[PDB]
Amino acid sequence: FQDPQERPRKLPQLCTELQTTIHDIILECVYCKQQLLRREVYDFAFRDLCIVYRDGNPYAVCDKCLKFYSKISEYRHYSYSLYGTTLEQQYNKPLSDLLIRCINCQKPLSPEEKQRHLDKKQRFHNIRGRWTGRCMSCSRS
Amino acid sequence: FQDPQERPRKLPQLCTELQTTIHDIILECVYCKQQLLRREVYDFAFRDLCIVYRDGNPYAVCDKCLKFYSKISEYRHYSYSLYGTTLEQQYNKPLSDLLIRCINCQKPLSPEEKQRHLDKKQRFHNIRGRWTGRCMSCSRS
Amino acid sequence: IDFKDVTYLTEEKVYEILELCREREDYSPLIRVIGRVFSSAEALVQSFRDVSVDIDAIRRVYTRLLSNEKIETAFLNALVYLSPNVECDLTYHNVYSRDPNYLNLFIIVMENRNLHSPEYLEMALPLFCKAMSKLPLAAQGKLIRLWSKYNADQIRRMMETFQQLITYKVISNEFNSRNLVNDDDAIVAASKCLKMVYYANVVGGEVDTNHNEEDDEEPIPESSELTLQELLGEERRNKKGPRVDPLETELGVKTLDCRKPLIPFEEFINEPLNEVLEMDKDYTFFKVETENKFSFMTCPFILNAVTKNLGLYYDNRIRMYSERRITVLYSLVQGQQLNPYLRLKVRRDHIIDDALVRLEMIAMENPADLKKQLYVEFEGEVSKEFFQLVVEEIFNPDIGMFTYDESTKLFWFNPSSFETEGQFTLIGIVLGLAIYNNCILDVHFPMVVYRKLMGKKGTFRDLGDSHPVLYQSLKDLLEYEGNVEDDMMITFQISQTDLFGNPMMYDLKENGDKIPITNENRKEFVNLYSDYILNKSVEKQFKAFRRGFHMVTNESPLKYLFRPEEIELLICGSRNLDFQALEETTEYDGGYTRDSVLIREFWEIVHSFTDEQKRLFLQFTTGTDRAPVGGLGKLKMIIAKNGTERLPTSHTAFNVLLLPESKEKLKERLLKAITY
Amino acid sequence: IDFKDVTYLTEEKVYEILELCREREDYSPLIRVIGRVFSSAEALVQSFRDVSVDIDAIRRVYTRLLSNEKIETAFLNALVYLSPNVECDLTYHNVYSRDPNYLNLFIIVMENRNLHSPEYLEMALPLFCKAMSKLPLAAQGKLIRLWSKYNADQIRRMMETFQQLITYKVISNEFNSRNLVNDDDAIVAASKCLKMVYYANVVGGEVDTNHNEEDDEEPIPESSELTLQELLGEERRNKKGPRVDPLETELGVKTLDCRKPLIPFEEFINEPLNEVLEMDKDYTFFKVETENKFSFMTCPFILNAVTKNLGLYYDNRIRMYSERRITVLYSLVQGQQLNPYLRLKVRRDHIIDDALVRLEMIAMENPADLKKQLYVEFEGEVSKEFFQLVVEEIFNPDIGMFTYDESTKLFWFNPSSFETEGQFTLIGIVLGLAIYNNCILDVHFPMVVYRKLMGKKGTFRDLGDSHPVLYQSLKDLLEYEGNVEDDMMITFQISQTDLFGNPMMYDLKENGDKIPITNENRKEFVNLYSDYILNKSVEKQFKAFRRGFHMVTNESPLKYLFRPEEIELLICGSRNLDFQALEETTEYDGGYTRDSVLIREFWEIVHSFTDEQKRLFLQFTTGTDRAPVGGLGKLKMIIAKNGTERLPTSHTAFNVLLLPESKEKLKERLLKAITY
Ligand SMILES: [Zn+2]
Ligand SMILES: [Zn+2]
Ligand SMILES: [Zn+2]
Ligand SMILES: [Zn+2]
């Protein structure tokens, strides 16, 4: 919980060392310090979100502050926006070999979701040097 | 203060019967019940605003709630928007013979201000059956 | 001899065309030269003279002429050059202020029966309509009141004149959103011309300026909005009302006052305009009149039932977008909590008793918030199926508000409700909340209910669709011959059944026992008893239903856009059923696409069933068996391919259906869940 | 004999053009036929072969040819047909991946000195530039590094090639906002071609890849933003930095590293593009690359000093519009109070001591909010004149941070400041806050100060503009001949004056007393002492000035758009003065118009005065004597006619001037208030 290599970084890495299932893991947020919701509980594994240690405490996020602060970083630290083609010519790497997350839900953007952006010519977003996208759960109206 | 004809309707009609100048009139708002600001004090005469009687109490407005609630009526009760020409053909009256106020500051729209709307082809706003415009103090950026 | 400078087309010109048809040999340009000054501006002011026009002349003048072939080409070219420089004769010269004589140049040109040939529409006819559309108000008023004396087929072929033009104009251009439809001036004109034809059928048809309702008590607004009118001193004067067309004001008539026109209103629709027009900014042209663009919602009769809600959906959204924007401002500057929805707490045992104290709280405390979007919540556990939970709970005989008539298969307001106006408020509110949120209901009301809401009472004419067994038993009085005092024992007092079962004796007169009915006041017996059950037995209950309906759609242009027939397809939905439009109104969410098999499995299992069971399916996807008003794909289907054994997750609101990544692997349990 | 199929323009073709100029009689099409296959795609891959091109061939081949007249018309038409179907030779065929040989077809065509004739620009030349603009990255890298060996006039006439095209293209079209400038492909191409010429002058000119600063410690972001990187696990890796052009990355060079090019950078500007281009969406093309439109801010050298701030104004506004939008969200969902401004409480006695604890609170607590718009408040009693209150309060010798040198008339960072880095933080911050809010200051800094901020240290070359009396006394060592140990008594240790007055002995070497200077380490004595006062006597103070400057304009593209010469006209303003542009940049607020008399009274009273006193006036309207950078009417004048005897109400921010509704009725008191 102090040294980086002993404390686990993800909930799949945690839940055995912290002796639980995916369901009955006991966690508190970093902003709200609340018992996380069960849809929120499962996503922190799946969206591959990473454990904060405030004062040696493994913290997670709640979703409504997760989508909030990602919108904050979107509004506050926005560098440029790029086509899906324009990474493979300028970063010069496959996008499935690239850790691009969602700009809203912060799940890593899917190999088919990235090909929508080359199909429908939709642009990515660069913030803080990191890359972001729009996931399929974040594509309803 | 109870019967309509004895209590005055405007501050010029009030300030002698209520024994003051335009400066040292003592008044409270209808929303905030505060001592009105002196720019706000003078405008309630000039913008020809009308005295509310809540429980027999002559109330006025403060400006920051005046511009607020006028924006509320703008957003909540908006019927249609009309050219400056389109009143003189449909109401069939001169606009200086017509009580059109400001949509923001609620001063009655000036005879030169209304001719801007026929010059630069800018549209009026109808709300609640009443007519509104944009005054020259409310035309800065 | 040739008669050039003097007034044309007169009886002198009738003998001149007759004597120039005398000796026909080599007479090629002389008839067009002796009809050319008919195609002149001031030469029809003077010729052929609440008007000064001779209709007795010209409708026999054109008859004498048609023994030839080239004159319709000769009549045409003069009017090509007439129409622009006569358009500025009222745009600039403004001649209606100068004379009432001026209108005669339209009618003489209009009565040509060879206008039925479509060769005018290259340039000639529409600009003749444009100045006719540029007529001033009282100029149009006398013109329409001149056309209040036509026959129907004269109006029909005059209606078919402009409709054939707007038949021609849609097949003329490919209209787009950069290829705008309100900037084309002729369809603006011809529909505005057809509006006069549409307003001819108002004043030409059946008129009842009298039996309007009690004027609807517009709701008391909130304490903030009441304050500002006292701050602006306008608490003396009342509102000038809704959207009002000026021709309604110019003629002094309302289309609601029209029982039956010459030819019925539903024939007066252009259908191909509707399928190419987007009302997304046509409604922006409706609330905000623009420079070179005019709103087709100011000619609402040209739209079918398919289209007039599509702007009313857009109208409610801008009232919902603003009511989103309002509670934005309250949490900002007032710090009062963001309330962006009409949240609705209910319990399924008590949803009437839940939503009564729920809505009448908002109907009292803050009357504004009913215009926020509906959002239904139960305890424990949506908004589209919520109305179905209300409808039979309101249209139950066991709830004590309505009766069902089995023959007509429609409901009716039961007047035997004692202290049920509170529950009568909600059925008004939920009728607005269905409309305002654009939802469909399974409601069987007589059209008099919709007729009475707009502002015109129930007549003898509305009695048949309500309940004919009463209606036949009063027209059979009027279709009788006998001395009805000695023949019939009927006096003014009647027997009206309470739900106890006992008929209650009601003197419709001041003393209905003491005065009997004769042949003459047989009319008077109807005019009490036709209005009795329809209007004034339920009058306190209907107004409490009206008050519930009014405070939801007062600010909406529903009264402006719609007729009481059109409300029936608007609140009650439609009974048609399409699926080819359904499978193309589905964007591929989840991953499943159309040509893969489990798309057509829904299609084939409903196409195996008969129509009612496809509607048993579409109760799950849309919300009910009742289709959306008009078309079916106007609500889109929504597919979802997300990861089976159980029943698919399927909503009514967002129209979703979950799908696992064969044809007959789930259909038995799926149809089981459908028919549960 | 004719040599058709084999490689053209070779020395064999030199003897063929010489022997076909032999016997000139009736030789009209033969020279264009023996130069036509030069105008072929694959025939210049093969012909004339870090490259494989013979520049020694072709620059004497063209010389032998010009004894005729029609060949420039003959050279032209082949290249019209070459250029589109060779544009897809790298757009589609992608031949640079296939060979490094391919580039040769550009250079041979380019070296025609009759390209100076403007007849190519009808269609021919720009599409030759388009494929040259469509070259890939390392293809451009070797191409530019091929042009790192040119002479200046070869670069100059190659620069003057594309500039004459963008001379031609502005006089070609009337560009608008529906008539967009980034959708025209040739000006996109030729400037991107000129970018390589602009990047030729980087790698062709003076190069210093070495003396960069310490890498600027990018600010610690707020506790919310630090959290999310720990939530995203990217606390390991750092930022990839600012906006970076890929040719900077492809060549590995930076334009900041360029001391002096071949021909100076300020010649490389298109001026008539700037006066017709709106950067309102060109900046939208900068942050958001688009399909058929490309940003001219990615070719910043084409813009003058007038224009590059005009996008930087638009850049700060979108960072201010968003920082408005952020505290919208905090009052909405967090309920933390709307703070839409950089409010700044001060007292005129203590504004340094006020804004130090003010800014360093926001520089510590929430480092984001410095990007909100500046708003200055005193006690008792604005933001534009606020900097003037700071500037001499910071550039005072009596405040203890700077020295003024009277000969150069510029300031310099005094290194004798003890524990004054806190006050050195603010002068960084206020330098950003002037720039970020786009305000002008009356600052006299040497260009080395701007040179050191961008990321390149102070050299011997920057020493003269700092203080030449030191700089001459070290170049005179280098411009001496003698045996400087026996001649000069100079060792590495020096005497540096403290503000006590006592010079402090400083061994610049490890033992400057023990090692003396000879002729050879005279270079080494400079390379310690040139960097001493300029970089490392003030190194802790400058970085605390840099840290103040960095955390305001780190996220701005100021480092991308600008060179250290351009900062001088950007933070220090301009010394020009216009009034004809002033009287047309005034919308009539209040009521007063231009042709009435009291408009020209301001004009005539300043035109009576000399320039410095017109600036004494314009200190009141703009804010200072220093003009806006470049033009004068870029800030608009603002007139006000609202109801006299006293001095007119005149702001610096909104540029207002009150006016009563003659010519010489107020000017004495007005100029009195000006010169108070
Ligand atoms: Zn949280
Ligand atoms: Zn997402
Ligand atoms: Zn107030
Ligand atoms: Zn105002």
Numbering used by the authors:
A (entry chain D), B (entry chain B): 9 to 149
C (entry chain A), D (entry chain C): 120 to 168, 231 to 562, 570 to 831, 834 to 851, 854 to 868
Describing publication, verbatim:
Human protein E6AP/UBE3A, the founding member of the HECT-type ubiquitin ligase family, was originally identified as an associated partner of the viral oncoprotein E6 of human papillomaviruses (HPVs). The E6 oncoprotein from high-risk HPV types hijacks the ligase activity of the host E6AP to ubiquitinate the tumor suppressor p5313, leading to the aberrant p53 degradation. The HECT-type E3 ligases have a characteristic C-terminal HECT domain consisting of an N-lobe and a C-lobe that are responsible for E2 binding and ubiquitin acceptance, respectively. Here, by using cryogenic electronic microscopy, we reveal that the structures of full-length E6AP and E6AP/E6 complex are monomer and dimer of E6AP/E6 protomer, respectively.
